[PDB]
Protein backbone atom coordinates (compact mmCIF):
# COMPACT_ATOMS: atom_id res chain seq x y z
CA UNK A 1 0.00 0.00 0.00
CA UNK A 2 1.30 3.39 -1.06
CA UNK A 3 -0.09 5.12 2.03
CA UNK A 4 1.56 2.49 4.25
CA UNK A 5 4.99 2.99 2.68
CA UNK A 6 4.55 6.72 3.22
CA UNK A 7 3.79 6.26 6.93
CA UNK A 8 6.87 4.04 7.37
CA UNK A 9 9.04 6.61 5.61
CA UNK A 10 7.68 9.38 7.85
CA UNK A 11 8.65 7.34 10.91
CA UNK A 12 12.15 6.95 9.41
CA UNK A 13 12.36 10.74 8.97
CA UNK A 14 11.46 11.25 12.61
CA UNK A 15 13.92 8.63 13.87
CA UNK A 16 16.75 9.87 11.63
CA UNK A 17 16.34 13.39 13.00
CA UNK A 18 16.35 11.96 16.54
CA UNK A 19 19.80 10.47 15.96
CA UNK A 20 21.07 13.75 14.54
CA UNK A 21 21.05 12.77 10.84
CA UNK A 22 18.90 15.34 9.00
CA UNK A 23 20.81 14.68 5.78
CA UNK A 24 19.45 11.09 5.70
CA UNK A 25 16.01 12.26 6.84
CA UNK A 26 16.01 14.68 3.89
CA UNK A 27 16.88 11.85 1.49
CA UNK A 28 13.76 10.03 2.75
CA UNK A 29 11.61 13.18 2.43
CA UNK A 30 12.53 13.11 -1.26
CA UNK A 31 11.07 9.60 -1.52
CA UNK A 32 7.83 10.63 0.17
CA UNK A 33 7.66 13.50 -2.32
CA UNK A 34 8.03 11.17 -5.31
CA UNK A 35 5.41 8.94 -3.69
CA UNK A 36 3.09 11.95 -3.51
CA UNK A 37 3.81 12.66 -7.18
CA UNK A 38 3.18 9.13 -8.48
CA UNK A 39 -0.10 8.82 -6.57
CA UNK A 40 -2.44 11.75 -6.01
CA UNK A 41 -3.21 10.97 -2.40
CA UNK A 42 -3.90 13.93 -0.06
CA UNK A 43 -2.94 11.71 2.90
CA UNK A 44 0.49 11.06 1.37
CA UNK A 45 0.52 14.81 0.75
CA UNK A 46 -0.23 15.46 4.42
CA UNK A 47 2.55 13.09 5.50
CA UNK A 48 4.98 14.83 3.14
CA UNK A 49 4.22 18.21 4.73
CA UNK A 50 4.62 16.80 8.24
CA UNK A 51 7.95 15.28 7.18
CA UNK A 52 9.17 18.54 5.62
CA UNK A 53 8.10 20.33 8.82
CA UNK A 54 10.07 18.03 11.14
CA UNK A 55 13.16 18.35 8.94
CA UNK B 1 10.06 -9.38 -1.86
CA UNK B 2 7.50 -9.86 0.90
CA UNK B 3 9.60 -11.80 3.41
CA UNK B 4 12.45 -9.28 3.20
CA UNK B 5 9.95 -6.47 3.82
CA UNK B 6 8.74 -8.25 6.96
CA UNK B 7 12.34 -8.62 8.16
CA UNK B 8 13.08 -4.93 7.53
CA UNK B 9 9.98 -3.90 9.47
CA UNK B 10 10.89 -6.15 12.40
CA UNK B 11 14.32 -4.53 12.60
CA UNK B 12 12.59 -1.13 12.57
CA UNK B 13 10.34 -2.24 15.45
CA UNK B 14 13.40 -3.29 17.47
CA UNK B 15 15.27 -0.08 16.59
CA UNK B 16 12.35 2.18 17.51
CA UNK B 17 12.02 0.57 20.93
CA UNK B 18 15.78 0.98 21.39
CA UNK B 19 15.53 4.75 20.85
CA UNK B 20 12.50 5.02 23.13
CA UNK B 21 9.57 5.44 20.68
CA UNK B 22 7.18 2.54 21.35
CA UNK B 23 4.34 4.44 19.67
CA UNK B 24 6.17 4.40 16.34
CA UNK B 25 7.17 0.78 16.94
CA UNK B 26 3.48 -0.14 17.37
CA UNK B 27 2.68 1.66 14.13
CA UNK B 28 5.28 -0.50 12.37
CA UNK B 29 3.70 -3.62 13.89
CA UNK B 30 0.44 -2.49 12.22
CA UNK B 31 2.32 -2.31 8.90
CA UNK B 32 3.49 -5.90 9.40
CA UNK B 33 -0.12 -6.88 10.16
CA UNK B 34 -1.25 -5.40 6.84
CA UNK B 35 1.55 -7.32 5.13
CA UNK B 36 0.65 -10.58 6.88
CA UNK B 37 -3.01 -10.16 5.91
CA UNK B 38 -2.39 -9.76 2.17
CA UNK B 39 0.19 -12.57 1.92
CA UNK B 40 -0.34 -15.66 4.11
CA UNK B 41 3.32 -16.73 4.49
CA UNK B 42 4.33 -18.80 7.55
CA UNK B 43 7.60 -16.88 7.92
CA UNK B 44 5.88 -13.49 7.68
CA UNK B 45 3.46 -14.71 10.37
CA UNK B 46 6.45 -15.76 12.46
CA UNK B 47 8.12 -12.36 12.05
CA UNK B 48 4.87 -10.60 12.96
CA UNK B 49 4.62 -12.64 16.16
CA UNK B 50 8.15 -11.85 17.26
CA UNK B 51 7.60 -8.12 16.53
CA UNK B 52 4.42 -8.28 18.62
CA UNK B 53 6.49 -9.78 21.44
CA UNK B 54 9.02 -6.94 21.44
CA UNK B 55 6.15 -4.48 21.94
CA UNK C 1 11.52 1.39 -7.22
CA UNK C 2 14.40 -0.96 -6.41
CA UNK C 3 16.97 1.87 -6.35
CA UNK C 4 14.86 3.76 -3.79
CA UNK C 5 14.67 0.57 -1.72
CA UNK C 6 18.45 0.17 -1.85
CA UNK C 7 18.91 3.78 -0.71
CA UNK C 8 16.50 3.18 2.17
CA UNK C 9 18.45 0.06 3.17
CA UNK C 10 21.80 1.87 3.06
CA UNK C 11 20.35 4.55 5.34
CA UNK C 12 19.19 1.78 7.70
CA UNK C 13 22.70 0.25 7.73
CA UNK C 14 24.22 3.59 8.74
CA UNK C 15 21.52 4.20 11.37
CA UNK C 16 21.72 0.73 12.87
CA UNK C 17 25.49 0.97 13.18
CA UNK C 18 25.01 4.38 14.82
CA UNK C 19 22.63 3.06 17.50
CA UNK C 20 24.91 0.08 18.14
CA UNK C 21 23.21 -2.91 16.48
CA UNK C 22 25.81 -4.06 13.95
CA UNK C 23 24.08 -7.42 13.75
CA UNK C 24 20.90 -5.86 12.39
CA UNK C 25 23.03 -3.65 10.15
CA UNK C 26 24.58 -6.82 8.69
CA UNK C 27 21.14 -8.33 8.16
CA UNK C 28 20.15 -5.28 6.10
CA UNK C 29 23.34 -5.57 4.05
CA UNK C 30 22.16 -9.11 3.31
CA UNK C 31 18.89 -7.69 1.97
CA UNK C 32 20.80 -5.30 -0.28
CA UNK C 33 22.73 -8.36 -1.49
CA UNK C 34 19.46 -10.11 -2.33
CA UNK C 35 18.29 -6.97 -4.12
CA UNK C 36 21.64 -6.63 -5.90
CA UNK C 37 21.47 -10.23 -7.16
CA UNK C 38 17.84 -10.10 -8.34
CA UNK C 39 18.37 -6.84 -10.27
CA UNK C 40 22.03 -6.51 -11.32
CA UNK C 41 21.29 -2.76 -11.28
CA UNK C 42 24.70 -1.00 -11.33
CA UNK C 43 23.56 1.73 -8.92
CA UNK C 44 22.24 -0.87 -6.47
CA UNK C 45 25.65 -2.55 -6.60
CA UNK C 46 27.24 0.84 -5.86
CA UNK C 47 24.97 1.31 -2.86
CA UNK C 48 25.81 -2.26 -1.78
CA UNK C 49 29.54 -1.51 -1.78
CA UNK C 50 28.86 1.68 0.18
CA UNK C 51 26.92 -0.34 2.77
CA UNK C 52 29.65 -2.97 2.97
CA UNK C 53 32.26 -0.31 3.66
CA UNK C 54 30.25 0.94 6.63
CA UNK C 55 30.11 -2.58 8.09
N1 LIG D 1 8.88 -0.77 0.44
C1 LIG D 1 9.46 -0.59 1.77
C2 LIG D 1 9.66 -1.97 2.40
C3 LIG D 1 10.33 -1.84 3.76
C4 LIG D 1 9.42 -1.02 4.67
C5 LIG D 1 9.20 0.37 4.08
C6 LIG D 1 10.55 1.07 3.92
C7 LIG D 1 11.47 0.26 3.00
C8 LIG D 1 11.68 -1.14 3.58
C9 LIG D 1 10.80 0.12 1.63
C10 LIG D 1 8.55 0.22 2.70
Amino acid sequence: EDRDTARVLLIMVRSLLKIGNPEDAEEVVKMIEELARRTNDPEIRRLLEEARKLV
Side-chain angles (χ1 to χ4, degrees), chain A:
Chain A
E1 179 84 80
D2 287 339
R3 277 180 299 248
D4 285 351
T5 304
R7 314 196 137 273
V8 172
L9 295 176
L10 171 62
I11 288 170
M12 296 194 47
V13 167
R14 170 177 309 104
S15 298
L16 287 159
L17 296 164
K18 207 81 182 176
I19 61 160
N21 200 307
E23 65 275 22
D24 284 359
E26 173 57 26
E27 193 37 53
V28 176
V29 170
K30 285 174 196 111
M31 298 171 176
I32 308 179
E33 167 199 334
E34 270 320 310
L35 212 31
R37 228 152 288 289
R38 266 144 78 211
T39 78
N40 225 344
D41 197 311
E43 172 56 19
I44 303 190
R45 293 206 202 92
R46 183 186 79 86
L47 295 149
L48 175 47
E49 281 309 289
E50 208 203 314
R52 283 173 171 154
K53 177 166 153 23
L54 293 172
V55 169

